């Protein structure tokens, strides 16, 4: 019922300080293929899941999506207290326990859980994030698909702090509803690593983030500290 993305107002967030901790199992996650969709970068995965949290049961990882802007100043989708990061990784998970496929999960408000990891541009070359920029040479055209070149552990792309905000919203392209898990703490990357994304053909792709929507009266943002 809430269109994504949003500005998260920390002063309005509801503290849920009795939740089970969030359990991330990316040890068995393996990247299958990488896509240039013409609009964004998609990395598909097999294996790996997340458990609650607020989660009624576990949700399997299916894919990763990357967003940026034309400046290292302004590129993420979600904001926190009107602060926009350089970029945003979205990790899509689906309710395989309840529904037979992703396609059936995408039609329900308890089918998709998306994890948001922010990208902060600094003077720090991320060796783990690099494993992704290297793939970019294979997928410059649109829409192209290539096998993910070599060894990569998603676990390395996790933030150093896993406190998070959560709310019921939608996919970034609005195609379906989804619950968001959003870490305020970003991972750090260099300008040289992000700029590579802007050299992908879109038919020229300088920016692909979406502006935020007003929070609806009945939309709650919960914080797990």
């Amino acid at each position: 019922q809430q269109l994504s993305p949003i500005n998260i107002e920390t002063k309005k967030a509801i503290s849920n300080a009795r939740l089970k901790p969030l359990d991330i199992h990316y040890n068995e996650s393996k990247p299958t293929t990488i896509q240039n969709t013409g609009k964004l970068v998609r990395i598909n995965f097999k294996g790996g899941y997340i458990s609650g949290g607020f989660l009624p049961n576990e949700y399997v990882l299916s894919s990763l999506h990357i967003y940026w802007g034309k400046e290292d100043d302004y590129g993420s989708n979600h904001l926190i207290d009107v602060y926009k990061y350089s970029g945003e990784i979205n990790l899509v998970h689906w309710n395989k326990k309840k529904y037979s496929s992703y396609e059936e999960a995408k039609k329900h408000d308890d089918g998709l859980i998306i994890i948001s990891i922010f990208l902060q541009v600094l003077d720090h070359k991320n060796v783990y994030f690099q494993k992704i920029v290297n793939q970019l040479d294979s997928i410059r055209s649109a829409n192209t698909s290539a096998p993910f070149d070599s060894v990569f552990y998603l676990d390395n792309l996790l933030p150093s702090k896993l406190d998070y905000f959560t709310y019921l919203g939608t996919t970034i392209n609005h195609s379906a509803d989804a619950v968001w898990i959003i870490f305020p703490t970003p991972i750090n990357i260099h300008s040289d690593q992000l700029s590579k994304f802007r050299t992908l053909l879109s038919l020229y792709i300088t920016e692909n983030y979406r502006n935020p929507y007003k929070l609806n009266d009945d939309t709650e943002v919960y914080y797990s500290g």
Epitope: G38, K39, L40, N173, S202, N208, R210
Partner: antibody, heavy 119, light 107 residues
Framework: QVQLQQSGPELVKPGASVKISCKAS????????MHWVKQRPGQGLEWIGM????????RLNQKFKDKATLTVDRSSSTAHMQLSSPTSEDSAVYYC????????????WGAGTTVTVSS | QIVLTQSPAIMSAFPGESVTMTCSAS?????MYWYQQKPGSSPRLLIY???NLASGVPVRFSGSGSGTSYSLTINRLEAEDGATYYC?????????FGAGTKLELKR
């Protein structure tokens, strides 16, 4: 020029499926959501649904769930809408319109395709 | 779904007169959008984000409102403004339009 070119007037036999088309030119087709809008002689504008061209992910108005099927031909930069088992209620003008990737408005519209369902 | 009620259904005024048309929503809308459709033509953006004029829209047009109540005003009507005007919300899916205000001219 940025332009949306729609197929010509369609006479459709009741119960006989129909596909109408919307060819985009002048811009990057994959980058903008394409929407379909229905207009009946006396019934205002109705949003049928939209499709994200980059991955063909569509969202349909539940009112048109079993009626309209939204597809795209990325190679030909053409969005399609199929109407299944049409009735006289499906007679209308159908617009394709592009919404801006950043601003939530419909910045380009086709001339509309008139569909008459009648025997 | 969010239902938008447009009043009046039909109206007319002389050129130079001020015209106000309202769009009422069944629940709160973040921003209202306005489309102008001249007879025989496709709809065309007039106002976006409640009160921003689309490129080339004459300054006699203005949009206003918040919550469940919004309006479009033409300050000094001109004959070429004869059209049906639709409000539209982008707060929840499905996207919905009002049934329109048909505006015609007096002479």
């Amino acid at each position: 020029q940025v332009q949306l070119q729609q197929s010509g007037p369609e006479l459709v036999k009741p119960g006989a499926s129909v596909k109408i088309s919307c060819k985009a030119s002048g811009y990057s087709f994959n980058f903008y959501w394409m929407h379909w809008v229905k207009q009946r002689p006396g019934q205002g504008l109705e949003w049928i649904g939209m499709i994200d061209p980059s991955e063909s992910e569509s969202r349909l108005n539940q009112k048109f769930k079993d009626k309209a099927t939204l597809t795209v031909d990325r190679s030909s930069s053409t969005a399609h809408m199929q109407l299944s088992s049409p009735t006289s209620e499906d007679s209308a003008v159908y617009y394709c319109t592009r919404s801006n990737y950043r601003y939530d408005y419909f910045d380009v519209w086709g001339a509309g395709t008139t569909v008459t369902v009648s025997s | 779904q969010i239902v938008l009620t447009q009043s009046p259904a039909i109206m007319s005024a002389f050129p130079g007169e001020s015209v106000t048309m309202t769009c009422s929503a069944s629940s709160s809308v973040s921003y209202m959008y306005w489309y102008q459709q001249k007879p025989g033509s496709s709809p065309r953006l007039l106002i976006y984000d409640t009160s921003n004029l689309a490129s080339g829209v004459p300054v006699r047009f203005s949009g206003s409102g918040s919550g469940t109540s919004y309006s479009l005003t033409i300050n000094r009507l001109e004959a070429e403004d004869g059209a049906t005007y639709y409000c539209q919300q982008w707060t929840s899916y499905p996207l919905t339009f009002g049934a329109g205000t048909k505006l015609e001219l007096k002479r």
